Amino acid sequence: SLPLSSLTHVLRSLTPNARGIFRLLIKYQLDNQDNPSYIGLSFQDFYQQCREAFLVNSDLTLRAQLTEFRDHKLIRTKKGTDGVEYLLIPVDNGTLTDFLEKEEE
Numbered sequence: 001s002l003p004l005s006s007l008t009h010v011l012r013s014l015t016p017n018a019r020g021i022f023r024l025l026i027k028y029q030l031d032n033q034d035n036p037s038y039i040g041l042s043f044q045d046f047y048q049q050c051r052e053a054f055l056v057n058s059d060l061t062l063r064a065q066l067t068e069f070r071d072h073k074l075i076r077t078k079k080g081t082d083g084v085e086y087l088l089i090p091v092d093n094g095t096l097t098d099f100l101e102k103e104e105e
Contacts, residue, residue: 001092002073004099010072018065020055022074023103025089026096033093039078040086 011019025046032038041049043063050056056065066087069075077085089096 001090001095004095004102007074007091007095007099008102010074014068017055018068019103020053021050021062021065022069022089023100024049024053024055025075025087026100029089030093030096030100039080040088042080042084042086046087 011022025041028041029038043066047056047059047062050062056062066075070077074089074091076088076090078088080086
């Protein structure tokens with residue numbers, strides 16, 4: 001797993017909204033970490049959530065952003081029973097927690 005400081009270093013060269021996007025995805029993973037049936041959010045679901053937080057306004061920009069995240073190994077996808085891609089972050093949840101506690105006091 002990637003350490004907190006490498007994670008921060010990747011994120012600091014992105015835009016404010018990209019950081020928001022990543023934090024929103026963290027929050028979903030951490031809030032559901034004790035549920036073995038949570039396998040992540042679909043793109044359409046996450047897109048709508050990002051749109052409601054004024055983090056993104058097009059399919060295109062979100063998709064570009066997730067693709068950049070994947071190349072940095074900050075997202076992974078897993079196909080559901082339905083053939084739909086579900087989004088998770090392949091970083092230890094302790095590290096992700098520490099990240100949120102720094103990104104606000």
